[PDB]
Amino acid sequence: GQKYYLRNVTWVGNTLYPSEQLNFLLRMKKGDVYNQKLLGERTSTDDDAIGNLYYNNGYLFYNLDPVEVNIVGDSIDLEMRIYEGRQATINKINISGNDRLYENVVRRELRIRPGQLFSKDDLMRSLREIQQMGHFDPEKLQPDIQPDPVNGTVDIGLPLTSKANDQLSLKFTNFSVANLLRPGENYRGILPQGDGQTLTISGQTNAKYYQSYSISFFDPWFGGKRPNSLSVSAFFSVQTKSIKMWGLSLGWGKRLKWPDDYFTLSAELAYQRYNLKDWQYFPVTNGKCNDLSLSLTLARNSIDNPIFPRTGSDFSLSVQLTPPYSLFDGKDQDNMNKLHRWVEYHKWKFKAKTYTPLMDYIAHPKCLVLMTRTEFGLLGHYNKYKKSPFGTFDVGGDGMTGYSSYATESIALRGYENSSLTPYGKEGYAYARLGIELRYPLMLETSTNIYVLGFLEAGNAWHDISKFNPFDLKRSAGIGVRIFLPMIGMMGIDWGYGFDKINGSKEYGGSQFHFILGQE
Amino acid sequence: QNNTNSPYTRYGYGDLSDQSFGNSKAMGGIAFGLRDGAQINPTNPASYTAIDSLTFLFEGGVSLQNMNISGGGLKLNAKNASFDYLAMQFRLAPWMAMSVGLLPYSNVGYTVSDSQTTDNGLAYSRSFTGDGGLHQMYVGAGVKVLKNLSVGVNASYFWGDITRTRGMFYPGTSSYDSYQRKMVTSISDYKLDFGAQYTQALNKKSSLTIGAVYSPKHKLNNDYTSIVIMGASSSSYGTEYKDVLDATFELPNTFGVGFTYNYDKRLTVGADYSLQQWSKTNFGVVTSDENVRQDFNETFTYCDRTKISVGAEYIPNLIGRSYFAHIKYRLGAYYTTPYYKIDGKKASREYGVTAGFGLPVPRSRSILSISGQFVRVKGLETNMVNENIFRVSIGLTFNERWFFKR
Amino acid sequence: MLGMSYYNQKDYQTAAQTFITYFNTYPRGTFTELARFHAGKSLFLDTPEPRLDQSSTYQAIQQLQMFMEYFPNSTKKQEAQDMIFALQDKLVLKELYSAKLYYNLGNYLGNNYESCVITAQNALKDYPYTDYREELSILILRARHEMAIYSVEDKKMDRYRETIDEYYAFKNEFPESKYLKEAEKIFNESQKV
C-alpha cells in the first residue's frame, strides 16, 4: 500500500551547494511517478548522488532523511532533510603489512598528509601510486577509514599485502646501498634490503658461442628528499674471430608540474664501444667504433595496475642525439670501416598505449578490456653518406631473439617468422607498428596472473627513411595467452597469421607461432 | 595494395581518401559545419575550439572492405583492409585548442594482368601493377575571435611515392630478357588549409552552425623518374637505364561549405558541398622522348571534382537507465563526380549510403564508433568497369581527464 | 614440555606457541611463571627494526600487561616492566621517524611542516614518559619556525608567537639541554616579530 505521484520536492539544511543544482542532480520534477530508489539511489548509492557529493568533499559528518508529507489522494510531497558537519582534517595515518619495506618508502608517495583536509581524489591518487609502485599487491587494497565526531578528525588505516619481486639473472627490487655499506643494527645474514632501490645482474656463460655480463642500479628518490631519480648500468659481451661490445650509461629523471603532475622527464648520457676483426654480419668488418649519446624522453603514465591495466594511458616521446662530427665541429667495401671511428645519428621515437574497459569494471572486477598500441621510429642522419651502421632497427617475430646482439634495436611484429622484414643488407632506418588487442583475464592473484587475448596488428620497416609510409603495412591477426609466475616474469603463447607477402615472397607469411618470455 | 584495388587508380594521384573521422564517416562525410566536441575533426580547423576544458582526445581508425568489380561480362571481387587516421587534440587556453595527427591523402593499388598466344605459336603474358600513395602529417590550431566565431589553420608536411609498372613476360621460353618500365614520382612539400565556423543561437534550445574551408593552389617539389629495367629474373636484377625528368605537379584550389542544425543536444542534421579546381592545374613534363611525354600527359589529367553529402545523428533520452538510450545513431548519403578523365571524356560517377553507431564506454567518456558504408561507382562509357564496394569501420575516441591540477 | 628447547635454539616462534598454547588451555599448564615469562621474552625477541610492520610489538605489550595481573606476585614483574618500556620507546621511535620524514620533505607539494608538528605532538600525547621527549620537543620547535617562515603575509605573527611559546615551553621542560644553541638562534630570529 503506497502512493504513486510526485507532487513536490523540497530541501532543508543545505548551505554548501545551490538548491537548483541539487534539484538537477536529484533528477526529479513535479508530476512524475513516486518511487523510492529513484530518490535513494540518487541520494545515497550512486557516484553523483548528493550524499557522495558531500562525502567525497571531506564532509563526512553528515546524515540525510527523505521526509514525506501531504500523503493524500495519489500524491506525496517530499522534503530533503540533511546535516552539514565540519570538514574533516586528517589526524593520523596507520600503515600495516610492510614485511620487507620501510615506511619511509611508502609515506613519501602518499598524497594525503596529516593536518590537511580530507578529499576523495587525494586518497584515490595515493592508492594509485601504491598500486603502480609494485612492492605490494595491486589487488585487495582498501583503506580503513575511521572518523571521530568529538574532535572532528579522521584517521586512515592502510592494510597492505606484501609480495616479493625476484627471479642467469637476478632482479633484486628492494635492495639498499646504505644498508650494504653500513648495516643498521643487525644484517643477520640477510641481504641489505630496504629503501625501494633496485639492483639487477644478468649474463650468458655459454662461452662457446655466446658470453655476456651486465649490471644495473636504480634509485627512485636520490638523496631521500625529492622525487628525482638516478639510474646507472654497464654491460660486456663476446660472440664467436669474434665481436666485442661494452659500455655504460648514467641517467636522471624528474617529475614535472607544467601540463599536470603525471608527466615525467628523463635525461640520459651513454657510452659504447664495438671491437672487431674479420667479422661479417655487420657492414663493419675490421676496427673499433665509439658513440656518445644524449637522450631526452618525455613520458606520461596514468594506468592503475602494472600487470593487467584497466584504465589510463602510457605515452612516450623520445629523441636521442650524438654530436654532428660531419659539420664544422669535426669537418674533414670501399671505405666504410673508415669515417666510422665515431658514428653519427639522431634517433626519434613515439610510443603510446591505451587501455579502456568495455564492461563497467569496479563491479565484477575481473572485467574485460580493449587495448591499443602505436609506435613510430626514425633513425635520421646528418650526412647522406655517413649513415650509422649501429643502432638500426630490426623487426619481425618475437623481438626477444634480437637480444642475442646489442648493436641493434629489436621490434616484435607478430605473425611474421623472426627478423623477417629486415634481412641482411636491408637494415631498418624507420619503422611503424600498430594494433588492437582485446583481453580477458582468467585469474588475478598475488602469486600468479593469467589472461587471454585476440589481436589485430600491422607493421613495417624501411631501409630508406625517405620512403617512410605508415599507410603501407604488413598485416596480421591471431590469438594468444600469457602467464605471470611467482618467481619468474612473463611466459606466453601467441599464434598469428600473416596475410601479406614480404619483398614479393609469401614464404614468411601464413600461420606462425611466437613464444614470449620476460616482458615485452 | 593496402587501400585500394580499383584499376581507376592507374590515373592521377590515385583516388583521394576522405579523412573523415568516426562520426563523419557514418554521417556521409558532413565535416565542414560540425562542432561535435566529443570527437576530433581535422577537415575544418575552426572545429577544435569545442573541446572540454580538462580533456585530451586521442583517436585512430580501421576499415575493412569487400569490392565487387564488374565489366564486359566478367565478374570478380577483391577484399582489403586499411589504417586511415590518427590524431591528438588538446586545449591551450579558454579560447584556443591545438591538434596534431597523421592522415592519408590518396592511395593507389592495382594489379591487372593478362595471358596471350600469337598465331605463330608464341605465348606471352603482360602485367601492369601500381603501388604507393601520398600522405599528410599536420599541426593545426583554432582560436575564438568572437563569442560566436572561430578560425583556424592546418600546416602540413605532404610527402609520398607513386610507382607504376608495365611488364612483358614469355612463359615457357628457355632463356630471354623481360622488359619492364617503372615510372616513379616521389613528392615532398607542404600544404596549407584554412577554415572558419560561426554558431547561431536559434530559439533558445536549438543552434545552427555554418562552416567554410579553403586551401590554395600549390606547386610541388618532386623527383619524377623514368626507369626501364631489362633482363630481370628470379635470379638476377637485370640492368636499369634510369632517366630523370623535369616534371611539374600541383594541387588545386579547393572550396567547401556546409551547415549543421542542432536541437536539445538530442538531434543534429546537416549537409555539405565542396569543389576542387582540378581542371585549372598545369601538369606537364619536358623531355625529348615522345613515348614518355604522351604517357605523362595521358596519366596526369583531371576534371573538377565535386561532392554533395547529407547526414544526421540522434541520441534519445540520454539520462534514462538503458544502454540503448546512450547509443548515438547515425545515417547519411553522398554523391561525387570523381576527377578521372579517361580518353577525352569524364570517367565515372559514384553514390554512397552510410550508417553507424556511437557506442559509449560506461564510467568513461571514450566512444567506439562502428560504422558501415555501401558505395557504387558507375562507369560512364562502355569500356570501363563498375564497382560495388561494401565497407565496415572501427574507430575509438580515447578521452581522459588530463590537464587537472590541485 | 617442549618450549624451553625451542627457546634455547632461538626458534622464538615455536617456543612462543608451545608455551602460550599450554598456559591458555590451562591457566598455568604445569610450568607456571617460567612458561609465561619465557613466552613474553620470546615474543619480544622477534621484534622488527623500528620502521617495519610492528605487528608483534603491540601483542607483546598487551601480553606483558596481562602477565602483570595474572602473576602480580612474580619477581618477573620488573623484568616485564622494563620490557614494556623498551617496547614503548620503539613504538615512539617509529612516529619520530615519521615526523622527521615530514620535516625532510618540507614545503614540497602539500605542506608537510604543519604535519610534522601534529605528528610529533601526537607522539608526545600518546606516550607521555618516553626517552625521546627531548627530540620530539626540539622537532616541534624547528617545524614551528619553519612554518613561520613560509606562511602567507596575513598569518605570520601568530606562527612566530607559537614558535616563541614552544621555545619557553622547551626551557620550562628542560632547563638544560644539549640542543639549546639552535633553539636560541630560532628565538633570536623570531623574537624580533
Residue numbers in the entry:
A (entry chain A): 291 to 457, 473 to 545, 590 to 681, 697 to 884
B (entry chain F): 23 to 428
C (entry chain D): 72 to 264
Relevant lines from the article:
The β-barrel assembly machinery (BAM) complex is a conserved, multiprotein machine that mediates the folding and membrane insertion of newly synthesized β-barrel outer membrane (OM) proteins. Cryogenic electron microscopy (cryo-EM) structures of the BAM complexes from the gut commensal B. thetaiotaomicron and the oral pathogen Porphyromonas gingivalis are similar and reveal a 7-protein, ~325-kDa complex with most of its mass on the extracellular side. Remarkably, besides BamA and BamD subunits, Bacteroidetal BAM contains a 14-stranded integral OMP that is intimately associated with BamA. The remaining four components, named BamH–K, are all SLPs and form an extracellular dome-like structure over BamA that may provide additional functionality to enable the folding and assembly of the many β-barrel–SLP complexes that are a hallmark of the Bacteroidota.
Class 1 lacks density for the periplasmic components but has good density for all extracellular proteins, whereas class 2 has modest resolution for BamA POTRA domains 4 and 5 and for part of BamD, but with poorly resolved extracellular areas. The 14-stranded barrel of the integral membrane component BamG occupies a key position within BtBAM. It forms a tight complex with the back of BamA (defined as being located opposite the BamA lateral gate), with an interface area of ~1,560 Å2 as analysed via PISA33, and binds Bt4306 (renamed BamH) via its extracellular loops (interface area ~1,720 Å2). A feature that clearly distinguishes BamG from FadL channels with a known transport role is an extension of the N-terminus of ~10 residues, which protrudes through the lateral opening in the barrel wall that normally is part of the FadL transport pathway. Similarly to Proteobacterial BAM complex structures, the cryo-EM maps suggest considerable heterogeneity and/or mobility within BamA and BamD. Density for BamA POTRA domains 1–3 and for the N-terminal region of BamD is missing (residues 18–71), and the visible periplasmic components have a relatively low resolution. Likewise, density for β1 and β2 strands of BamA is poor, suggesting heterogeneity at the lateral gate and a loose association of β1 and β16 strands. BtBamA has a striking extracellular loop (EL) 3 between the β5 and β6 strands, which contains 13 tyrosine residues and probably projects inside the dome formed by the SLPs. There was no cryo-EM density observed for this 38-residue loop, which suggests that it samples a range of different conformations.
